[PDB]
Each structure stands twice: as structure tokens, then as C-alpha cells.
Design a protein around this ligand. Structure first.
Ligand code: CLA
Ligand code: CLA
Ligand code: CLA
Ligand code: CLA
Ligand code: CLA
Ligand code: CLA
Ligand code: CLA
Ligand code: CLA
Ligand code: CLA
Ligand SMILES: CC1=C(C/C=C(\C)CCC[C@H](C)CCC[C@H](C)CCCC(C)C)C(=O)c2ccccc2C1=O
Ligand code: SF4
Lengths: 212, 202, 738, 39
């Protein structure tokens, strides 16, 4: 009864509508298995949040570029900033590695053992590394504002909005990648261009995307 | 049933062991589908030429139909507000939606009037028959509230559509042979039913 | 009443049985305990008669099987076109088919396989393809590798379609037995439509595409200079330029004035001398004739209306006095046994492919093909081998039928019955004649070599010594040489120069010349004849006594394939028609190896070479060396061996490599050929003691192969080694010397 | 899906994939490190 990703057909078995963003879309039944499905839930959450990060930073930097603030174009920005500063690329990379490794490992072994990460074996903290749900580590740290601990209904709505904006951000960053891969320019530039002539600024005008 | 003059030599209407899309329902469905298409195609190809013949339309218009640009080798028109492919793109997505939901009916009747579709779902109950939905839209006016006149309209539709299909065949064949407008050919064969014929064009 | 009969959604679609080995068969479905389980599992995967008993379901199985087969072939052709479009010098060779070697395979810059990317002309670095795709595409008139790109793409699409077709027709809608049995319908359909239409469409493509573009090719215009094919289709102007008949279009055809169209339907015969290919006008005339023929042919039998014919009726009608029931019931038989139609088609098709190769080297159609001596030889040997194997497979499945589907109760006194009766006298006469043939034909060469070593060449059998001149073949050759005068007044040239006449030269290479026939050729023909007669002998014995024998009155009860019936009463070793077709494989390989030797040497000696006189490759040595086997071995083998035995350091070095490797594997087969599975299992028991000694036994009980399986492994490896050795030798020699 | 997983856990396909993995390993090895003789 809930709006299917494809109106008219019935949803699959392992897809029901229990999690936000469920429109019955697994034409390949990858989630036939509960463990794998739940894992995929967490993976989609993580990737969507990352894409949200990506889109936000990109759009900010691109505004700073187009308006005369001297902000580099994102795909150049990493090189240009490492050059403008006296930083060592491998050092940056390895410290970043350390950090992401530790935190992501904590998350990994929490997925393994649901609650062993809040035992207080860490320095002095307890339940502040206790996941509220799979992919939902709602605690005092991952929810100091405590949105999860009030109005579970509006909270579910927020989950809906979260996964929504997350899939949107994923497709958005892919889009940006494509815009640069095509035009060699800034996505905001190409935007203003399509603004100039929607009739004549598009992939069909690029002739590259559609090769005719 | 309408348009059945017993004209099935090879006996394709055989019900036993049917299946796939060899099945009377889908068969006549496609029949009337293509028939309506051909009606529209006749109107489309014929309009602009006679329209310019009346001069009520500009001469930038009224180029021969095939010279539109659908086959650029056959010639294209320019003055179109956008690109050929530009138009073609949105055209694709639109017809995708239309045909898809029509098929969703044909496979699951009435099953396009339940998921929220902007209030246009009572419109999408149609009936228990493809090619004949009706509904408030697909039957604006209750034309044929009696079944006699209903089947009358049905037969008229069938005859008109099959004939229009034949007309499209003729249009294509002549425009290939003489490379001129069908209206051109009409004017010609009227100038000479004797000297303006397919025999002349050899 | 012929119509369409199908069953909807018969088979489902799940990967369930995919996880279930042996599910198709009863016993294998029980799973493996010993190792032969896997072997037999594989062996019986496509024995649908073993699978079940439903004729209809088996028909559907084989139907989908054919679907998938076609899909495989589509894949292969498409990949060929793809690599032709992407990794070839075909356009260079188009600019110059006279000094660029067709090459389409490039390798990677690795440990040393890179040396093989030799120089074939046009700055290209790859491997000379002997397939002849270049001349093929030029005859078809392909110009831009873009065309091959499109071609490969469409092939991918076609393959995908065919595989979906198999899937749908097996799991979604599978036809019904009567539908499969509407035989006269199928015949009319195929006979008319498939062949006639294909030929006619090819002729149309020829006329409107290739003949114009190939005409301009031989005119000498740059390849990238000719207008496009569809542009040609548009502009009848240029078509009338090439041939003014086109100015009148088609009304002359509608007025039966075919004479005018002669500009493109000629009857020249012979080759285009500037090209060495057949006259494309003549080719199109050929194909359109074939087309009309098959078209009018496809309307012979009744399907749903009073007119037509009844195969059954006519076959029953045809009966003679000495023959009893004549041709009765065979209708019933063919309507029922898959293996019958199979074996029939296989024998016919093998014979065809042989004839194909024959006529192909006889009158090469492709541009500058005759020059590519290597391609000629290669395709010829290829198709010959394919045909012979088709023959033996025919014999195989015929014997298979005779074991399985046979029934006396329906065939009372038919051709089959009297055959079964007097089979002994038949086979006896066959033995005698084969023995005589072998004796005479072999002893000829042997007595020659004997007088030679004895220094009495006066007493040999040579075209100089005591002669055996094929007066028949030479008389017929001259007959064909003189035929066009009266028996073919509208003829310009004989179909072949070997009927007699002049020599055609394209680029110095000998394209074609008339070939004479000496006592040497007499002898080699008789050799071939004897060998083939031996092969038919062994096959016929296998099939005739497959069900029984005065030794085994109940042989039909032991299945088709079976090791033996013990060592009792002397020893039953190797008593299956399976074994018989095995032996036949052997004798066939022998036969065709001999034939290709004959072909290669005679070509090199009296045909090929370079014009100036004729610089014959071996200078016709064959003429006097072939009468003696010493001359054979030395002057042919030992001589032409140099190319392969010194090919190292060259891009062709792989030829000698694979030469030695084929030697290796061919000898490897012999351990199977000679050993004993009992001995083997004894060794198995020893080694499993060794293993269990360390608690390392495998669950699946290791087992020595069946007698049959060992036989098969050995023979496969043997034939592989032999054919590969010969293949390498030929390739290296011809690439070096041609 | 589970049927598919089982089909992949079947034996010859596993032998296949392991061999492919090893072979690609060694080919890339020789690619980036050509001509090994000692050490
Ligand atoms: C990180 C990648 C990722 C992963 C692991 C998942 C995982 C899942 N998606 Mg998918 N999905 C993704 C990205 C991903 N999705 C993106 C980017 C889109 C936008 C095109 C979608 C849109 C989408 C829809 C609309 C639906 C799913 C659904 C699902 C679930 C079953 C299939 C499963 C939890 C089904 C579900 O139940 O979602 C909760 C479902 O209805 N996904
Ligand atoms: C518009 C997007 C969006 C939305 C609506 C939500 C919604 C939610 N997030 Mg947040 N979150 C997002 C993006 C979003 N998140 C992004 C981009 C990140 C990466 C930093 C995270 C990382 C994140 C974590 C790690 C956690 C939340 C949590 C929550 C929940 C409580 C906080 C809240 O209501 O907000 C709620 C379901 C908490 C949760 O799941 O509580 C149960 C929690 O632990 N979010
Ligand atoms: C190889 C030859 C072959 C033959 C003899 C048939 C025979 C048949 N096909 Mg066809 N079919 C084939 C190839 C063939 N098909 C191919 C290559 C495809 C892939 C496009 C299909 C896909 C196909 C479909 C999808 C359908 C048929 C149908 C049919 C039936 C009516 C004709 C009949 C059983 C129709 C059928 O079975 O109707 C009941 C039908 O719906 N065929
Ligand atoms: C002159 C031709 C002709 C005739 C006589 C009819 C006759 C009829 N059409 Mg119409 N119809 C036609 C052409 C024609 N149609 C064309 C060209 C189209 C394509 C847009 C349609 C599409 C169409 C639809 C989709 C429906 C009708 C319906 C009907 C019926 C009631 C209105 C009636 C039998 C309605 C019907 O049968 O309702 C039950 C209905 O739903 N027609
Ligand atoms: C549906 C009815 C229809 C109508 C009213 C006409 C009318 C006409 N056709 Mg015909 N024609 C039709 C269908 C029709 N055609 C069809 C279905 C075909 C396909 C075989 C053709 C193909 C065709 C050709 C190729 C030619 C005509 C021609 C003509 C014209 C001259 C008469 C003649 O030779 O024929 C005349 C205006 C001829 C023409 O234009 O003569 C001046 C001509 O060249 N027709
Ligand atoms: C069916 C015939 C066929 C054959 C025998 C080969 C043979 C080869 N292909 Mg493959 N290939 C083919 C068709 C074929 N390909 C097709 C149809 C595809 C589409 C999937 C490709 C796409 C392809 C690519 C993209 C590449 C190869 C390459 C190769 C080489 C290494 C693998 C090898 C010579 C490699 C090559 O040619 O390297 C020089 C290479 O990069 N092939
Ligand atoms: C089987 C394939 C085939 C196809 C697709 C075509 C296609 C064509 N032919 Mg035809 N044609 C064919 C075979 C074919 N022909 C054969 C076998 C003959 C010999 C009788 C001819 C002889 C022929 C002539 C003489 C003419 C055509 C013409 C044409 C064109 C208009 C129709 C068109 C390009 C007309 C044309 O425009 O040619 C350029 C034309 O005048 N054809
Ligand atoms: C058209 C090709 C074709 C097909 C479809 C089959 C089909 C079959 N062959 Mg094979 N077979 C063929 C050609 C073919 N064979 C050829 C060319 C040979 C000669 C080497 C043989 C010789 C042969 C033998 C000797 C045997 C099979 C067997 C089989 C069966 C198991 C697979 C099956 C009926 C086995 C069987 O049980 O047949 C009933 C078997 O023992 N075939
Ligand atoms: C089957 C073929 C064949 C034929 C037709 C001949 C023909 C002849 N042989 Mg024999 N011969 C043959 C095979 C054959 N030989 C073989 C296989 C050998 C090898 C042992 C010999 C060895 C041989 C010798 C050594 C002599 C003959 C001789 C002869 C003559 C008959 C006395 C005659 C020339 C005699 C001869 O020289 O007559 C002129 C003679 O002395 N032959
Ligand atoms: C050598 C030999 C054997 C012994 C050899 C046998 C049985 C073949 C062994 C095949 C392989 C090597 C065994 C199967 C290996 C498994 C797949 C285990 C995994 C191995 C990995 C490398 C994949 C016979 O049994 C035999 C029987 C009849 C006539 C001739 C012969 C014969 O010549
Ligand atoms: S196993 Fe071999 S040797 Fe023993 S009886 Fe059978 S065929 Fe003869």
C-alpha cells in the first residue's frame, strides 16, 4: 500500500517498509539475508552521510570560487593547498589513516558485537559508545542534542529525511564528478551556463555524453 | 469481434495452446493501437501540405513531411525552437511514462488508480478492458451509452484504422518511388488518371 | 492440421538445482562417493535420452541447446570482427593487398612473447592471420574499420537475443510434440524461405553494394575515396554510370528483357585476372540462380490445403520387386529417432564441407586470395578435417540409434530387414575388396623403392618407368577443356584453368595453372580410395553388429558403450560399436593426413611458385620423387622441415615450439593407449596407503578410469598431438617459403 | 540469492577464482618487477 518504487508491482519479501527509504526496491534480492541486509543498511547510511559532506564542502568552495574570494576549484584544491602550505602529503595521509582506522574499527567491532564498545574499557566513558540502533549510534556523543530521545515519531521522520537527503547527496556528488569530467569546469559555472541557454547548454550540446 | 468478417485465413485466432503475445486479447489490442496510430499519422502527414496549398500557413512550413528531419538524409527543417535531440529526449521520457502505465493496466487492470497520482486515479480506473478504458477522461462524453451504437463506433474505429494503416503504407511507398508529396501525387493522378499512375513512374 | 502448439511456463527459473550436481539424472543426483561420479556426471550431462523418456521434453531440451549453440557462434564471430576493427592493419592491406600480410592479433609487451609481433607490412606488428578475413571483407567491400566495429556490436546483440530465446522457449513457452512433428511444414518453410531468401538478399547486397565498390577497387580508386553504400543506393545516377541498365531501373525486368541486364549478369567464367577472384557479375548470377531455385523449391508438400505431397505416401509408393516392402515405415522411423536425423545430417554435412574446400581451392573467389597460398592450404585442411569428423560422428549416432530406438516389430521385411539378413555376405565382400586395394596400392610404392635401392629404376612404376596413366581423368580434363565450344555455347571461359589453358598471374605469384596427372597421382588416388574403404569397413561392421553377432547374440543388451563381456570364451575385449567408431577415428586420421600430404606437395611442386617461367616452390620434384617413399620422406618432409627446425629467434619460433609440444603430447597419449586400469587401481591402493599413513585420505574414493574412459582420453590426446604437429609444420613452412 | 551463493560455493568455480587470483597476482608481479633472477 505504501508507494512502491515501481507502482503496480508488489514489493519483495525481505523488503517491507520497516526502514526509512523502503520503496520495495531490491530487484536483485541482495537483501534476502537478514545479516547482509542490516549490513547494507549501515553501509548505505555511512555512504549517504559521506556524500552529504562531499556536496556541502563542494558547493561552499564553488561559491567561494565563483565570487571573487580566490577559492580554488575543488578538484584542484587539494594540490593547490598542499602546495601553498609546507605540509607533507604522506604525513597528512598517514595521520588521517590512523584516525579513520581507529574510529571505523570501533564501529566495525560494534557491528560485530552490538554493545561491547560501551563497556567502559575505554578511558572512563560508558554508553557514550553504545549504539542506539544499527547504524544509529545515538548516545550522548553521537546525539548530545538528544533528538533521538524525544518524539520518536518526529525522529523516524528525521530518519526518512536523512536517508532521503543522503541518496540525494550521493547522486549529487556523482553529478558533480560528471559535470567536471565533461566540461572541465566548475559545476557552478556549468550551472550558470545552463541558466544562460537551457536551449543550448546541456549534455546534448556537449555531444560527448550522447556521442552523436 | 468488431471488424470480424471471418478474415482469418491462416487461423491466427486459434485459442488452444496460445501464449506469449500470440493471444487474441493482446492481438486485437495491438491492432487497434496501431490503427489509432495510423489515423494520427495520416492526419499528420497530410495536414501541412494541403495547408500550404491553402496558403493559410507560411511557406517556411508545409515542407514535405519526411523532410522534417526524422531522417536527416531525407532532409531536415530548421526553425525548431530547440535541437532535434533536445526535443527527442523529453519526448522519450514522456512516452515512457505513458506506455508504461498503459501496460501496467494491461497486466494488472485498474492497478494504476491506487498509488497516489495527483488525484488522476479515478481517471485511471478505466474499465476491465484494455483499448477501452473510458473513465471520465478516456470517455469525455457518454457517446455510446447504448451497446448497439457502441459496437457501431467500434466497427467504425476498426475499419477507419485498418484503412489508415493501408494509407500509411501507400504514403511510404509513393514517397519512396516518386520522392514527392502524397498530395503532389494526388494532384498528378488528377491531372492524368491516364498518364499519372504507378505505371508512368517506371 | 498444421498450427502452433505450445505450453506456457513449463519450467521455472531458480539457481536451486544449480547448487545440485547430477540433478538431471537419477543416480548421479545421489552425489559422489568415488571419483568416477564426477566423470560420469559430466559425460551424461547432455544425454537427454538418458535424462528421461519424454520425446517432447527432449525436443525442447535440444531446441534450447541449439539456441545456445547459435549464441556461442555469434559471440565468436562478433569478437573476431571486434579484434579485426581494433587490432588490425586491414585498411593498410586494402591500400595494398599485394605486399601487406593480413594480421589482426597483437600481443603484450611481456617476458618475450612480444618478439612474435613481427612485421607484416604497413608498420603493423602482429601475427599473420591465415583466415583470409581481409580478402573476405574486400570481396564484401568493407572499407572503414568502423564498419567492422558496428558488425561486432550487432553480433553481440544477436547472441544476447539468441540466448534469451533459448531461455524463453525452455522455461516460459515450450512447443508441443505434434508441433515439432509438422515435418512437411518445416521442410517447405526452410527449403523455400531460409535458403532462397538468404541467397537472394546476398545477391542484392552484392549487386547494390559490393560489385560497385569492388568494381571501383579494381578500378584503382583509393578506398577512402569511394562514396558510401547508402549514398550509392540513393543515387541511381552512379549506378547507371557503372552499368546503364540501371538507367532503365526495373521495368525491363518487368518486360522480360533480361538480355539488357547482362552488364552485371555475365557468364565469363574464370577469374578476374587483375584480381584472381571470380567475376563478381558471375557470382551474383550464381547466387540469384540459387535463390530462385530454392524459392520455387520450398512449395512441395501439403501443409493445410489439398495441394502438396505426402512424404509417407510417396515413400510407400516406391517399392521394387527384389525388395519386398520397399520404403515403407521409414516415415515412422524418422518421425521418432533423434539420432537418425542427427547421423543423416552429420554425414551429409561432412561430405559438403569436403566439397566446399574442394571447389574453393579449385576456383578461388576472393580478391588476391590465390596468392595467399597459406590461407588456401589452411582453410582447405581445416574444412577437410571438420568434414571427416562430421562423418564419424554420423556413424556414431547412427549406431547409437540402432542400439536404442530400434524395434523389429514395425519393420517386418524392409530394406533394413534384408540388410540385417545378408549383412555377413556384404561385409565379407567388403573385407576382400579392401584387402586387395591395400595390397596393390601399397606394394606399388614399395616395389618402386625396392627397385630403387636395388638400382633397377627401369623396373619401377614411374611416369618414366612402367606407367599407370589416368587416361580417364586426363580425357575428362580435356573434355571440360573443350566443353564450352558446343556443350556450352554461351560460355566464355572454363570454370577452372586446370581443365587446361593458360596461367593467371597476379603479383608474380602463380595464381592458377592447368594441372596434369601422372602415374604418381594415379597411385595416390588409389591410396586414398583404399583408406576410405577401410574406414567405411570398420564403421559398417560396428553398426551392423551393434545389436548382436554370432559371438554375442544379445549384444543389444549391453548398452551402446560397454568395456567388454569379460575374458571368457577367449576374451571379449573391445566389442562395442563405441570401440568400432574409436578405431574408425584412427583410420580416418590416417586417411586425411595422407590426403593433405598429397595436396600440399603437388601444390608446391606443380602449381605454386612465382612467375617470371614458373619458379615452382619445389620445382615439380614431386613428379619423380612421389613414386618412391624414400623420395617422399626426404624430398617433401626432410626438405620442408628446415623452416620449422630453424624458426627460432623469429616471430614464427612458436611454430617449432608447438611442434615439439605436439610431439610431446602425442607421445603422452600412448601411456593411456597401452596401460591397464587394473594396474592403475593397484597403484591407487598403494598411494592411498601412503596417504592414510598420514591421515590424508580424501573422502571421495579415488578410482581408476573405466576402460572406455581411458580409451577416450588416450585417443583424444593422440589425435591432438598429431594434428597439432602437422599444423605447426605446415604453418611455419608456408609462411617462410610463400 | 542463497541458491546463487551456494552455486558460487560449488567446487570448480572456487578452484577457478582462486587460480585467477593467484595468476593475476603473479602477472602483475612480473609487470611491475620485470626480469627477476636472484634474491
Ligand atoms: C551505499 C549504497 C547503498 C546501499 C548499501 C543500499 C542499501 C539498500 N537500499 Mg538502496 N539506494 C542507494 C544506495 C544504497 N542502498 C542510493 C544511492 C539510492 C538512490 C538511487 C537508493 C535507493 C533506494 C531505494 C529507493 C530503496 C533502497 C533500498 C535499499 C535496501 C534494499 C535494496 C538496502 C538497505 C530499498 C529499501 O528498503 O530502502 C530502505 C528501497 O526501497 N535503496
Ligand atoms: C539531513 C540529514 C540527516 C538527518 C535528518 C539525520 C537524522 C538523524 N541523525 Mg544524523 N547524520 C547525518 C545526517 C542526518 N542525520 C550526517 C551527514 C551524519 C554524518 C556526520 C550523521 C551522522 C549521525 C550519527 C553517527 C548519528 C546520527 C544520529 C541521527 C539521529 C538523531 C539526530 C537527529 O535527529 O539529527 C537522526 C535519525 C544519531 C542516531 O542515530 O541516533 C539514534 C547518531 O548516532 N547522525
Ligand atoms: C530458432 C527458431 C525459433 C522457432 C522455431 C520459434 C518458434 C516459436 N516462437 Mg520464437 N523466438 C525465437 C526463435 C524461434 N521461435 C527467437 C530467436 C526469439 C528471441 C527474440 C524468440 C522469441 C519468441 C517469443 C518471445 C515468442 C516466440 C514465439 C514463438 C512461437 C510462435 C512462432 C513458436 C513456438 C511466441 C510464442 O511462444 O507464443 C506462444 C512468443 O511469444 N518466440
Ligand atoms: C474514428 C475513430 C474512432 C472511433 C469510432 C472511436 C470510438 C470509441 N473510442 Mg476512441 N479512439 C480513437 C479513435 C476512435 N475511437 C483514437 C484514434 C484513439 C487514440 C487516442 C482513441 C482512443 C480511445 C480510448 C483510449 C478510449 C476510446 C474510447 C472509445 C469509445 C468511447 C469514446 C468508442 C467505441 C473509450 C472506451 O472505449 O471506453 C470504454 C476509451 O477509453 N478511444
Ligand atoms: C490506401 C489507398 C491508396 C490510394 C488512395 C492511392 C492512390 C494512388 N496511388 Mg497508391 N498505393 C497505396 C495505397 C493507395 N494509393 C498502397 C497501400 C501502396 C503500396 C503498394 C501504394 C503505392 C503506390 C505507389 C508506389 C504509387 C502509387 C500511386 C498512386 C497514385 C496513382 C495511381 C496508381 O498508380 O496507384 C494514386 C494517387 C502511383 C503514383 O503516384 O502515380 C502517379 C505510384 O507511383 N501508389
Ligand atoms: C571472441 C573473440 C575474442 C578473442 C579470442 C579475444 C582475445 C583477446 N582479447 Mg578480447 N574481446 C572480445 C573478443 C575476443 N577477445 C570481445 C567481443 C570483447 C568485449 C568484452 C573483448 C574486449 C577486449 C578488450 C577490451 C581487450 C581484449 C583483449 C584481448 C586479448 C587478451 C584477453 C586477447 C587477444 C585485450 C587486447 O586486445 O589487448 C591488446 C584487451 O585489452 N578483449
Ligand atoms: C535482396 C536485396 C535487395 C534490396 C534490399 C534492394 C534494394 C533496392 N533496389 Mg533492388 N534489386 C535486387 C535486390 C535488392 N534491391 C536484385 C536481386 C536485383 C536484380 C533484379 C535488383 C535490381 C534493382 C534495380 C535495377 C533497381 C533496384 C532498386 C532498388 C532500390 C529501390 C527499391 C533499393 C536500394 C532501384 C534503385 O533505385 O536502384 C539504385 C533500381 O532501379 N534494384
Ligand atoms: C551435432 C553434434 C552432436 C551432438 C548434438 C551429440 C550428442 C550426443 N553425443 Mg556426440 N558425437 C558427435 C556429435 C554430436 N554428439 C560427433 C561428431 C561424434 C564423433 C566424435 C560423436 C560421438 C559420440 C559418442 C561416441 C558418444 C556421444 C555421445 C553423445 C550424447 C551425450 C552428450 C549425445 C546424444 C555419447 C552417448 O551416450 O551418446 C548417446 C557417446 O558415447 N557422441
Ligand atoms: C602390390 C604391388 C606390386 C606390384 C604390382 C609389383 C610388381 C612387380 N614386382 Mg613386386 N614388389 C612389391 C609390390 C608389387 N610388385 C613389394 C611390396 C615389394 C617389396 C618386397 C616387391 C618387391 C619385388 C621384387 C624384389 C621383385 C618384384 C618384381 C615384380 C614384378 C613381378 C614379378 C613386377 C615388376 C620382380 C621384378 O623385378 O620384376 C621385373 C622382382 O624381382 N617385386
Ligand atoms: C595414468 C592412468 C590412470 C591414473 C590416472 C587417473 C585416474 C587420472 C587422474 C586425474 C586427476 C589428476 C585426479 C583428480 C584430481 C582432483 C580434481 C583433485 C584436485 C586437484 C587440483 C590440482 C585441481 C588410470 O586410472 C588409467 C585408467 C585406464 C587407462 C589408463 C589410465 C592411465 O593411464
Ligand atoms: S578388463 Fe580388459 S583385459 Fe579384462 S576382460 Fe575386460 S577388456 Fe579384457
Amino acid at each position: 500500500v505504501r508507494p512502491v518504487w515501481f507502482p503496480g508491482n508488489p514489493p519483495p519479501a525481505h523488503l517491507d517498509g520497516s526502514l526509512a527509504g523502503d520503496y520495495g526496491f531490491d530487484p536483485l534480492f541482495l537483501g534476502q539475508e537478514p545479516q547482509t541486509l542490516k549490513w547494507y543498511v549501515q553501509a548505505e547510511l555511512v555512504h549517504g552521510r559521506f556524500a552529504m559532506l562531499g556536496a556541502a564542502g563542494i558547493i561552499l568552495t564553488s561559491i567561494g570560487a565563483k565570487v571573487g574570494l580566490g577559492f580554488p576549484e575543488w578538484y584542484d584544491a587539494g594540490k593547490v593547498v598542499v602546495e601553498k602550505n609546507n605540509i607533507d602529503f604522506p604525513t597528512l595521509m598517514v595521520i588521517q589513516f590512523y584516525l579513520m582506522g581507529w574510529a571505523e574499527t570501533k564501529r566495525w567491532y560494534d557491528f560485530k558485537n552490538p554493545g561491547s564498545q560501551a563497556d567502559g574499557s575505554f578511558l572512563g566513558f560508558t554508553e557514550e559508545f553504545k549504539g542506539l540502533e544499527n547504524g544509529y549510534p545515538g548516545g550522548r556523543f553521537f546525539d548530545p542534542m538528544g533528538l533521538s530521545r524525544g518524539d520518536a515519531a518526529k525522529y523516524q521522520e528525521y530518519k526518512q529525511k536523512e536517508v532521503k537527503n543522503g541518496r540525494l547527496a550521493m547522486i549529487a556528488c556523482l553529478g558533480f564528478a560528471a559535470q567536471y569530467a565533461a566540461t572541465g569546469k566548475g559545476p557552478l559555472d556549468n550551472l550558470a551556463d545552463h541558466l544562460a541557454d537551457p536551449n543550448h547548454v546541456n549534455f546534448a550540446t556537449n555531444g560527448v555524453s550522447i556521442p552523436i | 469481434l468488431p471488424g470480424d468478417f471471418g478474415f482469418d485465413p491462416l487461423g491466427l485466432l486459434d485459442p488452444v495452446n496460445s501464449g506469449g503475445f500470440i493471444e487474441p486479447k493482446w492481438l486485437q489490442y495491438s491492432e487497434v493501437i496501431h490503427a489509432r496510430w495510423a489515423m494520427l499519422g495520416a492526419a499528420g502527414c497530410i495536414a501541412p501540405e494541403v495547408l500550404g496549398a491553402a496558403g493559410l500557413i507560411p511557406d517556411a512550413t508545409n515542407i514535405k513531411w519526411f523532410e522534417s528531419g526524422v531522417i536527416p538524409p531525407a532532409g531536415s527543417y530548421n526553425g525548431y525552437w530547440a535541437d532535434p535531440y533536445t526535443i527527442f529526449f523529453v519526448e522519450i521520457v514522456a512516452m515512457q511514462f505513458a506506455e508504461l502505465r498503459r501496460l501496467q493496466d494491461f497486466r494488472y487492470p485498474g492497478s494504476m488508480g491506487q498509488q497516489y497520482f495527483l488525484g488522476l486515479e479515478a481517471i485511471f480506473k478505466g474499465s476491465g478492458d484494455a483499448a477501452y478504458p473510458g473513465g471520465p477522461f478516456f470517455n469525455l462524453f457518454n457517446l455510446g451509452k447504448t451497446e448497439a451504437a457502441m459496437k457501431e463506433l467500434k466497427l467504425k474505429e476498426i475499419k477507419n484504422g485498418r484503412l489508415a494503416m493501408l494509407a500509411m503504407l501507400g504514403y511510404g511507398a509513393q514517397a519512396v518511388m516518386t520522392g514527392k508529396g502524397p498530395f503532389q501525387n494526388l494532384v498528378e493522378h488528377l491531372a492524368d488518371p491516364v498518364n499519372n499512375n504507378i505505371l508512368t513512374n517506371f | 492440421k498444421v498450427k502452433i502448439a505450445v505450453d506456457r511456463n513449463p519450467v521455472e527459473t531458480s539457481f536451486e538445482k544449480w547448487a545440485k550436481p547430477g540433478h538431471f539424472s537419477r543416480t548421479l543426483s545421489k552425489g559422489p562417493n568415488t571419483t568416477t561420479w564426477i566423470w560420469n556426471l559430466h559425460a551424461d550431462a547432455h544425454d537427454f535420452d538418458s535424462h528421461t523418456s519424454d520425446l517432447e521434453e527432449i525436443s525442447r531440451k535440444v531446441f534450447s541447446a541449439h539456441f545456445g549453440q547459435l549464441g556461442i557462434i555469434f559471440i565468436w564471430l562478433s569478437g573476431m570482427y571486434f579484434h579485426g576493427a581494433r587490432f588490425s592493419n586491414y585498411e593498410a592491406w586494402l591500400s595494398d593487398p599485394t605486399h601487406i600480410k593480413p594480421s589482426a592479433q597483437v600481443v603484450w609487451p611481456i617476458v618475450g612473447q612480444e618478439i612474435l609481433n613481427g612485421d607484416v607490412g604497413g608498420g603493423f606488428q602482429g601475427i599473420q592471420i591465415t583466415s583470409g578475413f581481409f580478402q573476405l571483407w574486400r570481396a564484401s567491400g568493407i572499407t572503414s574499420e568502423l564498419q567492422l566495429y558496428t558488425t561486432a556490436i550487432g553480433g553481440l546483440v544477436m547472441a544476447a537475443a539468441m540466448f534469451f530465446a533459448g531461455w524463453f522457449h525452455y522455461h516460459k513457452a515450450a512447443p508441443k510434440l505434434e508441433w515439432f512433428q509438422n515435418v512437411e511444414s518445416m521442410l517447405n518453410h526452410h527449403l523455400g524461405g531460409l535458403l532462397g531468401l538468404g541467397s537472394l538478399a546476398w545477391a542484392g547486397h552484392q549487386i547494390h553494394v559490393s560489385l560497385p565498390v569492388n568494381k571501383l577497387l579494381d578500378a584503382g580508386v583509393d578506398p577512402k575515396e569511394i562514396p558510401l553504400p547508402h549514398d550509392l543506393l540513393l543515387n541511381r545516377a552512379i549506378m547507371a554510370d557503372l552499368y546503364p541498365s540501371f538507367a532503365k531501373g526495373i521495368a525491363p525486368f518487368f518486360t522480360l528483357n533480361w538480355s539488357e541486364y547482362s552488364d552485371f549478369l555475365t557468364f565469363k567464367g574464370g577469374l578476374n585476372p587483375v584480381t584472381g577472384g571470380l567475376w563478381l557479375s558471375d557470382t551474383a548470377h550464381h547466387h540469384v540462380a540459387i535463390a530462385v531455385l530454392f524459392l520455387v523449391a520450398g512449395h512441395m508438400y501439403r501443409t493445410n490445403w489439398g495441394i502438396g505431397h505426402s512424404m509417407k505416401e510417396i515413400l510407400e509408393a516406391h517399392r521394387g520387386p527384389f525388395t519386398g516392402e520397399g520404403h515403407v515405415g521409414l516415415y515412422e522411423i524418422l518421425t521418432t529417432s533423434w539420432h537418425a536425423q542427427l547421423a543423416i545430417n552429420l554425414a551429409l554435412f561432412g561430405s559438403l564441407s569436403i566439397i566446399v574446400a574442394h571447389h574453393m581451392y579449385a576456383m578461388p573467389p576472393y580478391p588476391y586470395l590465390a596468392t595467399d597460398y597459406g590461407t588456401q592450404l589452411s582453410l582447405f585442411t581445416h574444412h577437410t578435417w571438420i568434414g571427416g569428423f562430421c562423418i564419424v560422428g554420423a556413424g556414431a549416432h547412427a549406431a547409437i540409434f540402432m542400439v536404442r530406438d530400434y524395434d523389429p516389430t514395425n519393420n517386418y521385411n524392409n530394406l533394413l530387414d534384408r540388410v540385417i539378413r545378408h549383412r555377413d555376405a556384404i561385409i565379407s565382400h567388403l573385407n576382400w575388396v579392401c584387402i586387395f586395394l591395400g595390397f596393390h596400392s601399397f606394394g606399388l610404392y614399395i616395389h618402386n623403392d625396392t627397385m630403387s635401392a636395388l638400382g633397377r629404376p627401369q623396373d619401377m612404376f614411374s611416369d618414366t618407368a612402367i606407367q599407370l596413366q589416368p587416361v580417364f581423368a586426363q580425357w575428362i580434363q580435356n573434355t571440360h577443356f573443350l566443353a564450352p565450344q558446343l556443350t556450352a555455347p554461351n560460355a566464355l571461359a572454363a570454370t577452372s584453368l586446370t581443365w587446361g589453358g593458360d596461367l593467371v598471374a597476379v603479383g608474380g605469384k602463380v595464381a592458377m595453372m592447368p594441372i596434369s596427372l601422372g602415374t604418381s597421382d594415379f597411385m595416390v588416388h588409389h591410396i586414398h580410395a583404399f583408406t576410405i574403404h577401410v574406414t567405411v569397413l570398420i564403421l559398417l561392421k560396428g553398426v551392423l553388429f551393434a545389436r548382436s553377432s554370432r559371438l554375442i547374440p544379445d549384444k543389444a543388451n549391453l548398452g551402446f558403450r560397454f568395456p567388454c563381456d569379460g575374458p571368457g570364451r577367449g576374451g571379449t575385449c573391445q566389442v562395442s560399436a563405441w570401440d568400432h567408431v574409436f578405431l574408425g577415428l584412427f583410420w580416418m586420421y590416417n586417411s586425411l593426413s595422407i590426403v593433405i600430404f598429397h595436396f600440399s606437395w603437388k601444390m608446391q611442386s606443380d602449381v605454386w611458385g612465382t612467375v617470371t617461367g614458373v619458379s615452382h616452390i619445389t620445382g615439380g620434384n614431386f613428379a619423380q620423387s612421389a613414386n618412391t617413399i624414400n623420395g617422399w620422406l626426404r624430398d617433401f618432409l626432410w626438405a620442408q622441415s628446415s623452416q620449422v627446425i630453424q624458426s627460432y629467434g623469429s616471430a614464427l619460433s612458436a611454430y617449432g615450439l608447438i611442434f615439439l609440444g605436439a610431439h610431446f603430447v602425442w607421445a603422452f597419449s600412448l601411456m593411456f593407449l597401452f596401460s591397464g586400469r587394473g594396474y592403475w587401481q593397484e597403484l591407487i591402493e598403494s598411494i592411498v596407503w601412503a596417504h592414510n599413513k598420514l591421515k590424508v585420505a580424501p573422502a571421495i574414493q579415488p578410482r581408476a578410469l573405466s576402460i572406455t574412459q581411458g580409451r577416450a582420453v588416450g585417443v583424444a590426446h593422440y589425435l591432438l598431438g598429431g594434428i597439432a604437429t602437422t599444423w605447426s609444420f605446415f604453418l611455419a613452412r608456408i609462411i617462410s617459403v610463400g | 540469492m542463497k541458491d546463487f551463493t551456494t552455486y558460487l560455493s560449488t567446487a570448480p568455480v572456487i578452484a577457478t577464482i582462486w587460480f585467477t587470483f593467484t595468476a593475476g597476482l603473479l602477472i602483475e608481479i612480473n609487470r611491475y618487477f620485470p626480469d627477476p633472477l636472484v634474491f
